[PDB]
Design a protein around this ligand. Structure first.
Ligand code: ICS
Ligand code: ICS
Ligand code: CLF
Ligand code: CLF
Ligand SMILES: [Fe+3]
Ligand SMILES: [Fe+3]
Lengths: 380, 522, 522, 386
């Protein structure tokens, strides 16, 4: 689907699976199965915020790899994978599960990670998830998302099907597909909790394996990133009868609309609490608008994303752009600021009422910075 | 909640009471987290000698490696040539990662393409990918040359680069005369530095192997300089400056300094500077070839000695005082140019700085890591400063390199407490700095996590990181620094001594407790 | 109380239990110390707005000044001339202090003599001291020229430097032709920079006033550069480098970079480099004279415009981006040389670094201090970076300079919360950073005590110091840095952004507390 | 008197008085009366270590000055000095006294700091000590020491002459003339306390005004720096009948001999405790010697100080002299000698380290000597191509 020999930042299936879906799960150890490159380049590369003690009970920013050498390629890496799992158990005893994310060579040398995963999982009474996420599969990270979701469904999601000990409430929701970039999911979750809902599950961002296992016990599935987690959402809608819906917390308008839509799916008490939360946060985002819209009104951003921009008086186009929203360094060299709706490189959160202030400040900072006005030497 | 006049970013927004309460509820209700006392116990255990023994018994698991894969080095090498497009035959994910890694270190655009080999190519091979990719790359980006490397997919399926490129040329996808040097860069062999060596040898071979009949050694009165895998722009600059200052004709080969440092003047420059094809073709006519980083330029050295017939000198990396002296003396001998008064004065100024700072530098204990040549140069300079390197780690090092470093350590009284580790990762190093605590670490940005861990044990156990090496992601513009020559030695010395002094100021800043030693004059 | 294997210096030796107990006994028994609760109350009070009002009502007391006395600047100016011995007519203690101050900043030998005026000279004057001192200095140190300044004793007594030197020449103590320029440098007027200006004007007058008949403006096709009081060797070096790059003939009058940076090669060099007497004598023949630091070169400017008839361009200090551009354009205009591609590229690279770092730099609040030209340049650069200066302190500034800086601040949206203070000391600044806390301080080593004070109030109230200016005693080799031009802008920007990132790393290093924001990539 | 125009390093009377004697006192505010230069150059320039809250109850590292301008020179600075004292009282209420250290112009413009000091001291019930330490007086810091000691005697030392409320013991000593460079006095004091004595007074290093006032109540005066404090020591011997003696705690040999000499001035219990202290520290300094003497034995130092060098096996030998005698350490113009390729370290850790005195200081001294003498930086002066 991608033209050979053209520049693109498009990722692989491994990036979509390990980097996006599995990697943010804090209490599981994710093994980049194969040669050293992929895990090293992906290590701590995405700002999927979590709370934990890294290297003891949480492992997100660490790079675990089998570090394939030539002998592993020639003779296979299944024995190495079993020994690696044993070593992981010895050195990281508080891990609550292991994922094995296949890199390219795993799919080509005929390694059977499924059998090793099953055997070692049975032996150690631990969840070991084999993910066939080899980079050459598909054309983009999208197939990686699909493969990772299938792994979630097959190995983790159904773990508590026969368990009925979890006390459920009618206001139980799961946030799915929020990767907690700069704490975005946290900024969303507080609003949901202030509305009276109980966020039983939140993954992958700041996600635990128990939360994934508890997801089929919730009343509603709020999906942030539909593209990557629609597969699991549909599966849960069929198997468990759990409704799912999309929510957009980017900017006050989208946040208010999404909160009202979510509350409309519950009783009157939740709707009343929703109105109270909106009323509480109204002066804060109004103050943010009052401060930053005069500095940003009329600026053209070229392209979820749209809401905050219109809330700040900005104009969205699809050019003469002041900002590009839809590779950053090329545009920067060309003299146009580049910024996604998520605050991936250094900032955030951007979602929710708290994130709106940060987003507005960053927009004003980037667009009105004098660095963009100094490209032309005064003698040229 | 946010106040419009003092907007808080993630830190310290999430330290607010409401966020703390929310996170506590999440953890207690749904995360099934281990009790804090258990976490504390396990952490303390991970900081012990028994844990270190278990950690060092690892045979299958690698945690936090201190190396990358070959095609990254191949891309860096290719970027050092004029109007050259790095081309990686294989899967696109690799190229995305390579570009991101270099963008984050250099904070510049990085050019690299892939031919997007997928499952179809996984079955039938990547010949069609090569033909289409070469055609599209040439048509779109108009390079003067395409340098081809490989991802692990292409290497495992056994794609024949030579045959594929020849078939592309033969079938009219690219002009026959268009330069397409290639190198097999298997990610499961060696490291990124190996990729650099393989790529350089491939380009040199492409431009020189079949036209050695008319070449005469030393007929252009120049010295070839092969930098190897280098991520400090200052190193290229300083080598060029020292050679020009000496009046020595030179040709830097794989010069990427211009392309990695384009000005921001409102236009995007895909290409800038670099070694020209004529320089590569004329390289066998040089007096000699000097390899700046010989410990990862073995294949290049074999080719240059065997084909160009250059008597490649036995020079260490020109780092520190002694090795810079040796490099300059060897260059003087080869070129016949005397060492100028300016370089002598610069050396004397470095010695002056050493004398001024030796009281603070002497006896300081360092854990360090990085690439083999860089690491051995840093060890040598530390020994020259009277510092004692204690934990020397080189994940991509070998036994011969280890023997060399052990010999260097044995020659110095400040190497008595030093151990060299090859094939060990940063988890091993974390154990080492817990069990045999040094004063400082020298390494790339990944060491920041180790510092974090040490601080968790206690402020008295914290090992501060000094960021020298590759990659540096959490600081800006350190890639512009220098580590080679007298100028690089001065920069390193200043960094070290001021890191020591900053740490001392931090630990003596407590009013009426430790500030008795908060001296104005240091 | 020492283990031979791990010997501890004062810190942390005195933190041992026995030393702690001894100090407690001393304090409790004999020191009659105020109770700790009283000390805490008074400290907290000193951090308040009410204390700030009382502090700012000071009219007779100065606490922690941010300036020195004239003869220090006179000595620095004199050291910039070839084989010139600085000579301070007055008491020896002054010269001891001057030499110690410069030794501590530069970590180099600093040559300066005194004629040791004592109580005998207090009544009869110092004529005999001048005769004997000039004779002895010439005989012993063989200088090519003796530059004479004065201590406060000589100025108060009313020693006539001109008459004393003429009498020394008349009575055979020194040869009549031997150059002995002089300047009155009263320590109770202005500051060290005023001393530099007075000394320079005295030397220029000595060499040019009586030989203006044969001088033609612009006959030597050169531009005079007067650096003023400058303690960064990189500033001299960068000005010379930039002017050489443009192919502009220049004469840097008072160049001390060589004498302050002699190599360590086993030989002591009393003199090195410096502006030659021939350059000073030929200076009126230059096309024009550029004053790098015009706000403390007023007397020099008057002399150069009135006597040499040079149309001195109205230039700010070449600091930051706009002012460097203006400086280069003015040099181009005067000399007729176009700005070369190398300087354009360097400017573009500075702009690139600014663009890369603007997200971290924007909106940061700074309290800064130092000398007028340096301070205004730093303020301009901070405004160019989008940073917000809040407390601008210049102890030796004047009302005209303050008006200028206020005009600069008014022209920028980032100068809205900035106030300029003249005649205020570092105790005033301590109050200011307590009551209106900035993110960082930029200043010399004395600001470390302020940071200590802020840390005592709490970690959240700590204001880290960034060491730019003079003098820097607690760090090594920062005198080699650059602050002028594009290179100086790059160095300053790097220091600022990495200080911000370093502080953020420290604040986010807490495991399971703040480390969620301990990002690898910044 | 110094020869005019010969680049000496000697300080002035102000340096001797403000820098050395008065300045280390911690609970007093010292005003550098005159133009700005002297206080700025002397600020925190000596490592006279102290314990306190700087700017609240301690003021050692701060620079207080009258910052004389032209008007002050022409019309005098007495009114400015009175106003300054008022401002000091307002902004630093926990100060326990003020000294006024005269700079050069003070002695030449006919300012009467004594009258101002008396009037303001009477008004504020505060000890204000006028010191006429103008830099041009005398030929070196030595007269500054003399003037500062006379000021101490006249204004502070006799304050508790009629007071008898201090409970005295037979083991009362005062540490006089130790400036606590890098904590040297503390390293000395701990030994004296371990010997059974109590150091009632220790000044000026880490000194308080109350300790100076209590000095006439001690049984013995242990003087470290005889040159700078012999005047006050003889005064207290003549007036209060307090014996005084010099002590040398530089290196184990001098420390042991001094401890025994001091203990010999007391009863048998102090001598027994002295023997116990010596026995306790013997293995520590012996270990230091065992480690460092092989690295330093035979090295020659040029030019009290002698003891530690000999304890480390170094020989004290005491322009073409340096090339002839070929010293390893100058040990007696630091950057000049350093440019000539010879280390220069004194017996006090003036620049960056210490303490050097006492048993604890001997380890630091030995380590620093080995560090500086055996550093490879000294072996790299000659370029290999030259
Ligand atoms: S998963 Fe997808 S490329 Fe939906 S592969 Fe990519 S963290 Fe993008 S536009 Mo990186 S389909 Fe997420 C994405 Fe969007 S990694 Fe993130 S930003 S919302
Ligand atoms: S007081 Fe004197 S010059 Fe005795 S003025 Fe000087 S802190 Fe020296 S040899 Mo600096 S008579 Fe003290 C001295 Fe010795 S300042 Fe120190 S080291 S033991
Ligand atoms: S598309 Fe994706 S990132 Fe690429 S390899 Fe394949 S799973 Fe991995 Fe890995 S070690 Fe280096 S970076 Fe590659 S060449 Fe192999
Ligand atoms: S011998 Fe001593 S240090 Fe000299 S002045 Fe006199 S008391 Fe003081 Fe002061 S302000 Fe500057 S440094 Fe002098 S010229 Fe006057
Ligand atoms: Fe850049
Ligand atoms: Fe020096």
């Amino acid at each position: 689907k991608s033209q050979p020999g053209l520049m693109t930042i498009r990722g692989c299936a491994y990036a979509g699976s390990k980097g996006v879906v599995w990697g943010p799960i804090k209490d599981m150890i994710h093994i980049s199965h194969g040669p050293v490159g992929c895990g090293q380049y992906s290590r701590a590369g995405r700002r999927n915020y979590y709370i934990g003690t890294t290297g003891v009970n949480a492992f997100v920013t660490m790079n675990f790899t089998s570090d394939f050498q030539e002998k592993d390629i020639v003779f296979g890496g299944d024995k190495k994978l079993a020994k690696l799992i044993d070593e992981v158990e010895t050195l990281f005893p508080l891990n609550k599960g292991i994922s094995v994310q296949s890199e390219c060579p795993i799919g080509l040398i005929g390694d059977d990670i499924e059998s090793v995963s099953k055997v070692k999982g049975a032996e150690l009474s631990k969840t070991i998830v084999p993910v066939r996420c080899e980079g050459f599969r598909g054309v983009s990270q999208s197939l990686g998302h699909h493969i990772a979701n299938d792994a979630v469904r097959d190995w983790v999601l159904g773990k508590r099907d026969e368990d009925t000990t979890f006390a459920s409430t009618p206001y139980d929701v799961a946030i799915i597909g929020d990767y907690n970039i700069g704490g975005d999911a946290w900024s969303s979750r507080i609003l949901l909790e202030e509305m009276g809902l109980r966020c039983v599950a939140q993954w992958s961002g700041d996600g635990s394996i128990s939360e994934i296992e508890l997801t089929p016990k919730v009343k509603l599935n709020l999906v942030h990133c539909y593209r990557s987690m629609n597969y699991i959402s549909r599966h849960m809608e069929e198997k468990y009868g759990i409704p799912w819906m999309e929510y957009n917390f980017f900017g006050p308008t989208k946040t208010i609309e999404s909160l009202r839509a979510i509350a409309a799916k519950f009783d009157e008490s939740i709707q009343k609490k929703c109105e109270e939360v909106i009323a509480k946060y109204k002066p804060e985002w109004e103050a943010v608008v009052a401060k930053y819209r005069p500095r940003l009104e009329g600026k053209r951003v070229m392209l979820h994303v749209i809401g905050a921009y219109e809330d700040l008086g900005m104009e969205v186009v699809g050019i003469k752009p002041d900002l590009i929203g839809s590779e950053k360094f090329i545009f920067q060299k060309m003299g146009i600021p580049f910024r996604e709706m998520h605050s991936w490189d250094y900032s955030g959160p951007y979602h929710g009422f708290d994130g709106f202030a940060i987003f507005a400040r960053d927009m004003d900072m980037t667009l009105n910075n004098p660095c963009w006005k100094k490209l032309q030497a005064p003698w040229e | 909640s946010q106040q419009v006049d003092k907007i808080k970013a993630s830190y310290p927004l999430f330290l607010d009471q409401d966020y703390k309460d929310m996170l506590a509820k999440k953890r207690d209700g749904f995360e099934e987290k281990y009790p804090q006392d258990k976490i504390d116990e396990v952490f303390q255990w991970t900081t012990t000698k028994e844990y270190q023994e278990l950690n060092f018994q690892r045979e299958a698991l690698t945690v936090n490696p201190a190396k990358a894969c070959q095609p990254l080095g191949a891309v860096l090498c290719a970027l050092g040539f004029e109007k050259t497009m790095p081309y990686v035959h294989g899967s696109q994910g690799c190229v995305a990662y390579f570009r991101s890694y270099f963008n984050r270190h250099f904070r510049e655009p990085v050019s690299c393409v892939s031919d997007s080999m997928t499952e179809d190519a996984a079955v039938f091979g990547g010949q069609q990918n090569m033909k289409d990719g070469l055609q599209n790359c040439k048509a779109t980006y108009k390079p003067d040359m395409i340098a081809v490397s490989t991802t692990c997919m292409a290497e495992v399926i056994g794609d024949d680069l030579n045959a594929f490129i020849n078939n592309s040329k033969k079938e009219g996808f690219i002009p026959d005369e268009f330069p397409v040097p290639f190198a097999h860069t298997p990610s499961f062999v060696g490291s990124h530095v190996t990729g650099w060596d393989n790529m350089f040898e491939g380009i040199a071979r492409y431009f020189t192997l079949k036209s050695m009949d008319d070449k005469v050694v030393g007929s252009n009165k120049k010295i070839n300089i092969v930098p190897g895998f280098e991520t400090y722009l200052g190193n290229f600059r300083v080598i060029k400056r020292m050679l020009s200052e000496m009046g020595v004709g030179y040709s830097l080969l794989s010069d990427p300094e211009e392309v990695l440092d384009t000005p921001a003047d409102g236009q995007f420059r895909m290409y800038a500077g670099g070694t020209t094809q004529e320089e590569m073709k004329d390289a066998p006519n040089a007096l000699n070839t000097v390899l700046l980083q010989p410990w990862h330029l073995e294949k290049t050295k074999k080719f240059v000695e065997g084909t160009w017939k250059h008597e490649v000198p036995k020079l260490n990396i020109p780092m520190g005082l002694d090795w810079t002296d040796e490099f300059l003396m060897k260059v003087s001998e080869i070129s016949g140019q005397p060492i100028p008064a300016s370089l002598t004065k610069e050396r004397g100024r470095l010695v002056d700085m050493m004398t001024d700072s030796h009281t603070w530098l002497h006896g300081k204990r360092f854990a360090l890591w990085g690439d083999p040549d860089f690491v051995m140069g840093l060890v040598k300079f530390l020994l020259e400063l009277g510092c004692e390197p204690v934990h020397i780690l080189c994940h991509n090092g070998n036994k011969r390199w280890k023997k060399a470093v052990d010999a260097i350590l044995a020659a110095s009284p400040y190497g008595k407490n030093a151990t060299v580790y090859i094939g060990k990762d940063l988890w091993h190093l974390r154990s080492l700095v817990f069990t045999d605590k040094p004063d400082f670490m020298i390494g790339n940005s990944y060491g920041k996590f180790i510092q974090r861990d040490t601080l968790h044990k206690g402020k008295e156990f914290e090992v501060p990181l000094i960021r020298i090496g590759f990659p540096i992601f959490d600081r800006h513009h350190l890639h512009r620094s220098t580590t080679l020559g007298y100028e690089g030695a001065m920069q390193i010395l200043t960094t070290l001594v001021n890191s020591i002094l900053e740490r001392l100021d931090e630990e003596t800043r407590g009013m009426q407790a430790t500030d008795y030693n908060h001296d104005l004059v240091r």
